[PDB]
């Protein structure tokens, strides 16, 4: 029902391949938000029309504080427009470049917010990803928000669990593996399986080979070792992560 004439456009927040993201403002309420413009050309060049169909109807019927909200959408027969929540503080990725690594307080809270978001997703029968730092945005108070970034703004091997790479079947447990890769990146400043080649990285993931720098504490080492298990069924539940000693002792956001 929306139309482009309903919005004022500000500066470009990101130019990508499929399109751009602009700062915008609904004319009636003066509400600030983000507007994605997707080119039907590039959508036509590839085959995602059905894939585009999916995400939208889902994200629409999806309301949670740690999940970027999608408000609406519309088209003009050459372009596709998405209306999203605007997240003023930017990307967790850029923060990690600025600070190098996070402290246990900051990390424990991020993990808490991610676990809550993921647990909501599971309840609505949904499995997301790859929750890479570049797909994690920040609200005005500093609170994390899962975007499921369109790449309108690594490799992606570093965040995939063993079962997904090797060709085997996978379930909700893939999210617990991601959570542990992320927890480690937050405290150390790089993912635990990073390497100069795709081959070595593969090898380290499938064989779960990684180590800690001295400064990582035992309660941290403990939670990460429990998420990073080759056998998916041996990975904890989201619920047990929220109640972990290291989490409860360092997180400022309640479960
Ligand atoms: C750069 C800055 C930091 N930035 N970026 C955002 C931002 C956050 C989320 C999105 N959402 C999407 O892109 C969704 C795309 C798709 O569902 C999709 C579906 C089917 C496809 F085939 C595809 C395709 F990619 F294959 F085409 C995509 C977009 C921008 C943002 C924000 N909301 N607030 C503040 N700053 C912000
Ligand atoms: Cl092993």
Q: For residue 86, say whether it is annotated as part of any ligand binding site.
A: yes
**Residue ranges of the domains in the chain?**
1-90, 91-250
Collapsing DSSP to helix, strand or coil, 34 comes out as strand
Phi/psi for 19 (5° steps) reads 170, -155
Q: Which residues surround ligand 2, an ion (CB under 5 A)?
A: 208, 230
Q: Does domain 1-90 have CATH number 3.30.200.20?
A: yes
Q: What's the DSSP call for residue 82?
A: E
Q: Pick the residue whose CA is nearest to atom 7 on ligand 1.
A: 149
The CA distances from residue 119 to 84, 91, 127, 160, 175, in Å, are 22, 22, 10, 19, 10
Contact partners, residue 202, CB within 8 Å, separation at least 6: 157, 165
- Residues 52 and 39: beta-carbon distance below 8 Å: no
The order of strands in the sheet holding 32-39 is: 7-15, 19-26, 32-39, 79-84, 70-75
How far apart (Å, rounded) are the C-alpha atoms in residues 145 and 66?
A: 4
Query: What three-state secondary structure class fits 137?
Result: strand
- 1-90 and 91-250 share one CATH topology? no
Q: Ligand 1 center to residue 58 CA distance, Å? A: 14
130: annotated active-site residue: yes
CA distances from residue 135 to 47, 55, 123, 150, 222 in whole angstroms, order as listed:
22, 15, 21, 9, 26
SS3 83: strand
| Distance from the alpha carbon of residue 201 to the mean position of ligand 2, in angstroms | 14
85 annotated as ligand-binding: yes
With CA atoms as reference, report the closest residue to 21 among 76, 87, 93: 87
**Where does the chain have alpha helices with state H?**
40-45, 49-60, 92-99, 104-123, 162-165, 174-188, 198-206, 218-227, 238-242, 245-250
| Domain with residues 91-250, CATH architecture | Orthogonal Bundle (1.10)
CB 67 within 8 A of CB 145: yes
Q: Which of 182, 222, 3 is nearest to 102 (CA)?
A: 182
Backbone angles phi, psi at 136, to 5 degrees: -115, 115
Give every CB contact of residue 148 below 8 A, 6+ residues apart in sequence.
55, 59, 68, 128, 135
- Whether ligand 1 lies within 6 angstroms of the CB of 19 is answered as no
135 is in an annotated binding site: yes
């Amino acid at each position: 029902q929306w139309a482009l004439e309903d919005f004022e456009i500000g500066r470009p927040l990101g130019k990508g391949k499929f399109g751009n993201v602009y700062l915008a403002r609904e004319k009636q309420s003066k509400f600030i938000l983000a507007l994605k413009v997707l080119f039907k050309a590039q959508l036509e060049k590839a085959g995602v029309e059905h894939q585009l169909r999916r995400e939208v109807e889902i994200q629409s019927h999806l309301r949670h504080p740690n999940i970027l909200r999608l408000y609406g959408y519309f088209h003009d027969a050459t372009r596709v427009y998405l209306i999203c929540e605007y997240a003023p503080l930017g990307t967790v990725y850029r923060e990690l470049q600025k600070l190098s690594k996070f402290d246990e307080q900051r990390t424990a809270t991020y993990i808490t917010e991610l676990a809550n978001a993921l647990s909501y997703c599971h309840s609505k029968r949904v499995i997301h990803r790859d929750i890479k730092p570049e797909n994690l945005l920040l609200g005005s108070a500093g609170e994390l928000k899962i975007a499921d970034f369109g790449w309108s703004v690594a490799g992606t091997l570093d965040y995939l669990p063993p079962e997904m790479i090797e060709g085997r079947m996978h379930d909700e447990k893939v999210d617990l593996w991601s959570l542990g890769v992320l927890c480690y990146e937050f405290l150390v400043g790089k993912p635990p399986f990073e390497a100069n080649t795709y081959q070595e990285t593969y090898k380290r993931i499938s064989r779960v080979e990684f180590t800690f720098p001295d400064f990582v504490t035992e309660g941290a080492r403990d939670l990460i070792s429990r998420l990073l298990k080759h056998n998916p069924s041996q990975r904890p539940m989201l619920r047990e992560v929220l109640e972990h000693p290291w989490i409860t002792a360092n997180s400022s956001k309640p479960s």
